[PDB]
Design a protein around this nucleic acid. Structure first.
Ligand code: Y43
Ligand code: CA
Ligand code: CA
Length: 426
DNA sequence: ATCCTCACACT
DNA sequence: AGTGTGAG
């Protein structure tokens, strides 16, 4: 079981929110620019950064005022605000554009607002039969890198890419319709078409990874950005993983990746191969150890889920520091703002996707607590009605109020969160 | 004071 | 049902 059964692609829009504003505002194209939300505090937090601005070291999470110190000619687009909070509608809608184009080629899994996995196994099969037995020309792959090539016995980047592609296509066994390397190559030709279709029909540029599973696809995608795709073959994995830091593989970027590194005394993904599956399972659990055992050999079976629609519709606002909501009527007003956006997006969903949400999830944070949420509670969602939702949300969080007064809210609320979930066909 | 999101595992 | 992790 070499884990070469499937062809999987991960497509990822290049600096997506920036492109969305650059498409709409041509003055911003091919310039250092970023997208920010909320202008008042330190110029606004940066959530997306064009590749021109990145070369000055501008990053996400920075304050816009500080980014202007790194890049004085940085241009800024501010996220729409509605009802006193950020409104992402323009980007969800531009996201819909991209998901619908990709869905014309294969079944996709929406992984985030701007990336989708594609299972190309079947599409590659059909294309292999229409392809008689004729060779794959390099012109079919004008923006594809083959990771690990060129090797063996040109100083500029496009030169390297071409030499690597040529070495790869020279040794392609195009007479064997079951060689896994042929299938990825044909998968990559389809992804070139997918990416040309996206750019022509939206103007949005993107990168893609093509491999045999989701984690290699995602890893491959970020090896050659922007506006390029990378094929990571099963055979490339030992050299690729030998110096790949663990935290770079999807889901090892957090506490678990930190435990793998610490407990085992290792640094790179390839070092995991020296351990038995029983050993990995003993340190990290049955499923995490089985998964680590196979993943460090480049094998993973997580399937491409057929799901293009989010499972939850959510809507939240932080109230940091001195702004924490300390009165009962303050908490009521913002729950109404939240419910009002929620209601408007839910009714778009019902009309667009023939489904209804049946459960309302209310979360709050409390000043003094350490974590994202401090409490989560749930009631029934029977009506796309902003007042009822916010009345029901208040009902189910009223007793969190440690205050003895009735008009006050102690401890003050630092976050409000409303989430419709548990959708059913309608 | 990166804010606002979404999926999923664990219990 | 509620919590926590990991990601965009
Ligand atoms: O913390 C965040 N808070 C609010 N919004 C965020 C956040 N993190 C990412 N986002 C939004 C904007 C980003 O454009 C889009 C895709 O995210 P993401 O793929 O990670 O980065 P990106 O498309 O901007 O650049 P790139 O893929 O070329 O590295 O998600
Ligand atoms: Ca992405
Ligand atoms: Ca992206």
């Amino acid at each position: 079981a070499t884990g070469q059964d499937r062809v999987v692609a991960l497509v990822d829009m290049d600096c997506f929110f920036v492109q969305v504003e650059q498409r709409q505002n041509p003055h911003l194209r091919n310039k250092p620019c970023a997208v920010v939300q909320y202008k008042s505090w330190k110029g606004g937090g940066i959530i997306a950064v064009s590749y021109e601005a990145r070369a000055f070291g501008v990053t996400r999470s920075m304050w816009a005022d500080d980014a202007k110190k790194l890049c004085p000619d940085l241009l800024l687009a501010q996220v729409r605000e509605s009802r006193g909070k950020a409104n992402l509608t323009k980007y969800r809608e531009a996201s819909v554009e991209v998901m619908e184009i990709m869905s014309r080629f294969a079944v996709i899994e929406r992984a985030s607002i701007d990336e989708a996995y594609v299972d190309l196994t079947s599409a590659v099969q059909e294309r292999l039969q229409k392809l008689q037995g004729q060779p794959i020309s390099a012109d079919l792959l004008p923006s594809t890198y083959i990771e690990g090539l060129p090797q063996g016995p040109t100083v500029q980047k496009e030169g390297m890419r071409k030499q690597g592609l040529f070495q790869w296509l020279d040794s392609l066994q195009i007479d064997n319709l079951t060689s896994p390397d042929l299938q990825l190559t044909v998968g990559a030709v389809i992804v070139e078409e997918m990416r040309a279709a996206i750019e022509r029909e939206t103007g949005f540029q993107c990168s893609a990874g093509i491999s045999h599973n989701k984690v290699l696809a995602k890893l491959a995608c970020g090896l050659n950005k922007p506006n390029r795709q990378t094929l990571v073959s099963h055979g490339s994995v030992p050299q690729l993983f030998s110096q790949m830091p663990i935290r770079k593989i999807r889901s090892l970027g957090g506490k678990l990746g930190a435990s793998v590194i610490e407990i085992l005394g290792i640094e790179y993904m390839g070092e995991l191969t020296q351990f038995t599956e029983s050993q990995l399972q003993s340190h990290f659990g049955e499923k995490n150890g089985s998964w680590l055992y196979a993943m460090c050999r480049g094998i993973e079976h997580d399937p491409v889920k057929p799901r293009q629609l989010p499972k939850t519709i959510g809507c939240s606002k932080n109230f940091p520091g001195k702004t924490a909501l300390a009165t009962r009527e303050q908490v009521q007003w913002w729950l109404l703002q939240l419910a009002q956006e929620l209601e408007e997006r839910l009714t778009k969903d019902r009309n667009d996707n023939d489904r209804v949400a049946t459960q309302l999830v209310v979360s709050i944070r409390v000043q003094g607590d350490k974590r994202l949420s401090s409490l989560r509670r749930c009631c029934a969602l029977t009506r796309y009605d902003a007042h009822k939702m916010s009345h029901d949300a208040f009902t189910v969080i009223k007793n969190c109020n440690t205050s003895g007064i009735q008009t006050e809210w102690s401890p003050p609320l630092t976050m409000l969160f409303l989430c419709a979930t548990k959708f059913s066909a309608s």
